[PDB]
Amino acid sequence: ETVNYNVQLFGSSLPVKVMEALSNASADEPMAACIHEGGWAWLACNDRLIIWKISHSSSAKLMVCKELPLPLSDSEWSADLVDICAQTGDPAAAQSVALMAATPEGSSRYWPNILHEGTYIESYTEFGSLCAFVTAVKGNSFILSSEKNQLVRLTPDASGKMNQRVLPQGQGMLSGIGRRVSTLFGILSPAVESTLCSVLWDDCFYTLTDSSINKWDLDDTSESQVLNWDMSRVLREYISDAIWGSESDYDDIKAGININYLSLNQNCDGLVILSAAWHPGDNPCQIYYTLVTVKDEGYNISDEITVEVTQFNPVFQARGMQLCQLVVPNFSSQACYLYTQEMIFACSTGTGRSTLPQEKIPFEAQGDNIVGAGSCEGWPVFFIRKSGMLTVVARE
C-alpha cells in the first residue's frame, strides 16, 4: 500500500452512466472531470457531460445523475470549460443547479436548471484556434478565460440572453498600449507575454500568467482591477536561491534558469503558487517543482516569500511535457497535493509545522490514471481511471 495514507473509495457506488463511461472508455480516450466544491462531479466523456451529486449517502432517493448533450466542437470538450452554479451557493438537488459549458473556440451553452436537460440557451464569445477555463463566480455568473488571458464575464439574463463583457484591463493582449517597442509602456509592455496558466476564484478572481498575477474584486455584475504583480521580477531570486543558491557557481548558474508558473491556489498563509524551474546545463538536468507562498495584503507584495522545494523532481524531457497541477483541500493545514496523470505527491507549504508526511502516491499501475482531483468537505479527492472517486486520508 501507501506508507502514511489510506487511499480508498470516497462516497457511495457511482451512477450507472458514470460506470458505463469508465468501463467502456479506452486508454486512447481523454476523460476529464470537474470535482466541484459544492459536492457535484461533472465527467466530460466523448460528446456528453455526466453530472452527478457526490453521494456521501448511499440512499437512492437522494441520488442525482443527469446527462447533458454538449454543443458540437471539432476539438475535445474539457471539464475545465465546464462549471456549476448553485442558487445562493447552496447545493440542494437538481433545481438549485445551473450549468454552463464552453468550447475552445468560444461557443457557450447554458442550462438554467440541471432538472431541465433539454432546456438551454446559447451564445458565442471568440478565441483563436486556445486552452481556456470556465469558472463560476458570484451573481450566478461565469468568467471565461482565454489562453492569451482575455477574461470575459458571462451573465445569463431572465430573457434567455447571455450578457457579456471583457474584464477591466483583461483584454488579453495589450490594453491602452499601441504597437511600438518602448513608448507605449504603461499598464502593460510590448515585449510582454500574457499566456495564461490558471485562474482562481475566491469576491476575488485571480489570473496567473507566464509573467504575472492579476486580481479583480467582483460584484454580481462588474469587476474592478485591483493589481497586476510582476511575480517573475519578485520571486525569481527566491526560487533560484532555494534550489541552486548554495552551489559554488550559483552566480553563473542563475542567469540561465528557466522558471514556469503553473498553478495558483490559496490557503491561510495566502496565495500558493506552483512553479517549475530548471537549468539546461545541469548534468543531470532535473525539473524542480516548488511551492511558493506569499501574502495577498492590499495591493502590494510583502518582503516575506517562502519557497518550498518538493520531492517531485523528474528528469527534464521537454517543456511541453512539464505538466503538474495543484490541489489544496484544507485551507489551514499547510498541505498541498501535486498531481500529474500517474501520481499524487503529498507536499508541504509554509513553515511545514502542521504539515502531513511528504509522500508520493502512485496511480500509474495497470492502465490506471489520475483523471482529476479536487476536494469534498476538506478531504483530498482523486478521480482515478480504475477505482473512481478516492480520498487520501492520513493514517494518524
- What does each C-alpha distance from 396 to 90, 349, 360, 393 come to in angstroms? 32, 19, 17, 9
> CA-CA distance, 6 to 380, in Å (whole number)?
11
Whether residue 125 contacts residue 170, with contact meaning beta carbons closer than 8 Å, is answered with: no
| Nearest CA among 392, 382, 372 for reference residue 43 | 372
> In this structure, how many other beta carbons lie within 10 angstroms of the beta carbon of residue 325?
17
How far apart CA 190 and CA 74 sit, in angstroms, is 33
CA dihedral angle for residue 22, residue 24, residue 30, residue 33, rounded to 10 degrees: -20
Nearest to 150 by CA among 179, 123, 175, 181: 175
Please tell me the number of Cα atoms within 13 Å of 221 on its side-chain side.
3
Give 349-373 as a DSSP string.
Answer: -TT-TTPPPPEEEE--GGG--EEEE
Q: 70-75: which pairs have CB atoms within 8 A and are 24 or more residues apart?
A: 70/44, 70/101, 70/109, 71/101, 71/103, 71/107, 71/108, 71/109, 71/122, 72/47, 72/107, 73/103, 73/104, 73/105, 73/107, 75/103, 75/104, 75/105
Q: Provide the β-strand partners of residue 65.
A: 52
Can the peptide bond before residue 30 be classed as cis, meaning omega within 30 degrees of 0? no
Cα(305)–Cα(239) distance, integer angstroms:
10
How far apart CA 271 and CA 248 sit, in angstroms, is 32
* C-alpha cell read off for 267: 490557503
In angstroms, the CA 15 to CA 21 distance is 10
User: 154 CB contacts (<8 Å, ≥6 apart)?
Assistant: 100, 108, 123, 125, 141, 142, 143, 144, 162, 163, 164
The residue whose grid cell reads 475545465 is: 80
Task: Output Rg (C-alpha) for the chain, integer angstroms.
Answer: 21
Partnered with residue 344 across adjacent β-strands are: 339, 361
What is the number of alpha carbons within 13 Å of residue 56 lying toward its C-beta? 7
Q: Compute the half-sphere exposure of residue 301: CA atoms within 13 Å on the CB side of its CA.
A: 19
How far is the CA of 306 from the CAs of 277, 279, 359, in angstroms?
15, 21, 21
Reading the block at residue 49, the C-alpha cell is: 457531460
The DSSP-derived string for 163-214 is EEEEPTT-SSS-SS--S-SSSS-SSS-TT----EEEEEE--EEEEEESSEEE
How far, in Å, CA of 31 to CA of 385, rounded? 9
> Do the Cβ atoms of 32 and 80 come closer than 8 Å?
yes
The H-assigned helical ranges of the chain are 16-24, 231-244, 250-254
| Cα 181-186-188 angle, rounded to 5 deg | 75
Q: Which of 184, 158, 154 is nearest to 167 (CA)?
A: 154
Separation between Cα atoms, residue 317 and residue 319, nearest integer Å = 7
Beta pairing, strands 359-362 & 343-348:
antiparallel
Strands 223-230 and 258-267, bridge-based pairing:
unpaired
Residue in 286, 274, 277 with CA at minimum distance from that of residue 256: 277
Location of C-alpha cell 502514511: 4
Dihedral of the alpha carbons of 303, 309, 315, 319, in degrees to the nearest 10: -30
> Which residues touch 118 (CB under 8 Å, ≥6 apart)?
none
Phi then psi for residue 212, to 5 deg, are -150, 165
Give the torsion through C-alpha atoms of 137, 266, 364, 8, to 10 deg: -90
Residue 226's Cβ-side half-sphere holds a number of Cα atoms within 13 Å equal to: 18
Residues sharing a CB contact under 8 Å with residue 311, sequence separation 6 or more, in sequence order: 345, 347, 358, 360
Task: State whether residue 8 is helix, strand or coil.
Answer: strand
- For residue 175, what are the contacts with CB-CB under 8 A and spacing of at least 6? 169, 187, 188
Give residues with Cβ within 8 angstroms of 375, minimum separation 6.
35, 37, 327, 328, 329, 330, 381
Q: Shortest CA distance to 85 belongs to which of 40, 132, 121?
A: 40
Q: Rounded to an integer, what distance in angstroms lies between the CA atom of residue 364 and that of residue 343?
A: 6
